[PDB]
Ligand binder design. Structure first.
Ligand SMILES: C[C@@H]1COc2ccc(Cl)cc2[C@@H]1C(=O)Nc1cncc2ccccc12
Ligand SMILES: C[C@@H]1COc2ccc(Cl)cc2[C@@H]1C(=O)Nc1cncc2ccccc12
Lengths: 304, 304
């Protein structure tokens, strides 16, 4: 028992982290096979970031200008190319530690682990969610760009995120591994509206099931609700509308505990309306939305 | 910016995880050099756990009875010995992936990362603290015993914890790497009093400094306090008494923000007395005590 904001073991991703330097700009790169993937803003100076013409900036760069270092060894760059907001530096050596991998585009509300890196060296790993407004509430300092987000299915690492920018609001934005931004962000130092965020309802419910599994049962009540009634409360509290697909996704957790999905929705409704009255659920004094139903089943079953 | 419950990258510890089986009991082992360290209860059956005589139980076991497997390869056991509550199985092969390491005994209030393992395979990593009553609030299922806790100083892994037991209360207990239990626990399936826990005051203050660094400043007030006055409030709320060593440990954070340690104690006092009035600090609706002043400086500076 016990429930933690657990991250995937970062070992398979630690072996891919390299440092990429171009001019006076240094950030992190991801070495898979004979390709190093890094944010394209590695070619910009601090001044360039205000309004960069990346096509023009890259035109001034050659293979020898991209210095790629893995630990203490230099990688020879035999080709560079820009795909959306990332740079792909083809190196002459395939990474001997390349794990099985995929590049995936996660959906908003999905979770992933981030291995925060500085100068190609990993500093820590943490679990977080893609917010419904396509931002992440990470912990990133200058030089952390190129740090990646991922999920792990036994031996296959599914890379979903690459860190690029911190918005003036202190929240973070990045791309999938093909350089496409999650959300409406552009890689320019300008004010960018993140948009209204909502709470991931399916995730809060999944975490309520985890609390029941792990002993916290005080929030369970003698009530039930319908999707339409629950959704009226969800709108009032800026929670994502719950659909039948969210209910179906909660199926196994509903089976485990025997608490019908709509009955748990009625528990969430009373918590939204009445608060927690100074009590905790799984050590939290708020309603946690960074655990998916998949995460909850995985953590409570033991999936390695 | 941003502040997360970040764990150390688990890669150097993933390479040490093995599966140890004895009879019908399987748990996790830690392979460093030519020694595999695992909880001594691997020799017990479910019945033995009620009142085990480990000296007698081990007398029935030989080197060939301990099956040690790393991934898909079998390790040859050339010697076994019991040190306190751990077993040391000498193997004929040194682990090719042994990192630089130390065995340390952490102090209550200190933090560490845990790589939860099942059948010698890592499932996830999470950051947690040694509670003042020498328990940990982990996330551990059956078969997770032998999972280790650690800290990492550049390339040196300092192993501080090995998981052994889940108390009826749902909290967890374990040993240092020399098999000594943290706290008064014995490795028997009997009711064991965990003892009164307190909140780690130096850690809450450190996290208040992190919130100031990262933007949350609403809890700052026009007040100051003394150690004696603050400690009277600390006792009333079951918080650890703050000493001058705790103040000195908070020195660098006090310098960074320019908020005197006693001024921050006065902010904590008003939060204890008035609550948070439905507001959050670093995304939490309670007072977080699982970040040490060292953790806060490390995360806010970028230490790799
Ligand atoms: C500094 C500029 C601002 O404008 C843009 C604009 C676009 C892009 Cl893709 C990057 C940046 C840079 C940035 O946000 N980098 C960072 C990313 N993460 C954490 C950071 C912590 C502190 C300092 C910078 C961080
Ligand atoms: C089950 C017995 C109980 O008595 C003792 C007594 C002493 C010892 Cl050192 C181990 C155990 C075992 C135990 O707690 N193991 C576990 C440790 N962690 C998580 C667990 C989740 C579920 C089931 C067991 C877990």
């Amino acid at each position: 028992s016990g429930f933690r904001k657990m991250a995937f073991p970062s070992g398979k991703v630690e072996g891919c982290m390299v440092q990429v330097t171009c001019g006076t700009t240094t950030l992190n790169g991801l070495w898979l096979d004979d390709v190093v993937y890094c944010p394209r803003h590695v070619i910009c100076t601090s001044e360039d970031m205000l309004n960069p013409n990346y096509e023009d900036l890259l035109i001034r760069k050659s293979n020898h200008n991209f210095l790629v270092q893995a630990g203490n060894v230099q990688l020879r760059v035999i080709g560079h190319s820009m795909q959306n907001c990332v740079l792909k530096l083809k190196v002459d050596t395939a990474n001997p530690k390349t794990p099985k991998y995929k590049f995936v585009r996660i959906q908003p509300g999905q979770t992933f682990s981030v291995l925060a890196c500085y100068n190609g060296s990993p500093s820590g790993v943490y679990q977080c969610a893609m917010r419904p407004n396509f931002t992440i509430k990470g912990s990133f300092l200058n030089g952390s760009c190129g740090s990646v987000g991922f999920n792990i299915d036994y031996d296959c690492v599914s890379f979903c995120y690459m860190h690029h920018m911190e918005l003036p609001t202190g929240v973070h934005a990045g791309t999938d591994l093909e350089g496409n931004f999650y959300g409406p962000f552009v890689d320019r130092q300008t004010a960018q509206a993140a948009g209204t965020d909502t709470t991931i309802t399916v995730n809060v419910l999944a975490w309520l099931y985890a609390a029941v599994i792990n002993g916290d049962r005080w929030f369970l009540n003698r009530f039930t609700t319908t999707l339409n009634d629950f959704n009226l409360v969800a709108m009032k509290y800026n929670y994502e509308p719950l659909t039948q697909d969210h209910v179906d996704i909660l199926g196994p957790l509903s089976a485990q505990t025997g608490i019908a999905v709509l009955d748990m929705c009625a528990s969430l409704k009373e918590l939204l309306q009445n608060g927690m009255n100074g009590r905790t659920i799984l050590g939290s004094a708020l309603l946690e939305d960074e655990f998916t139903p998949f995460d909850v089943v995985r953590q409570c079953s033991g999936v390695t």
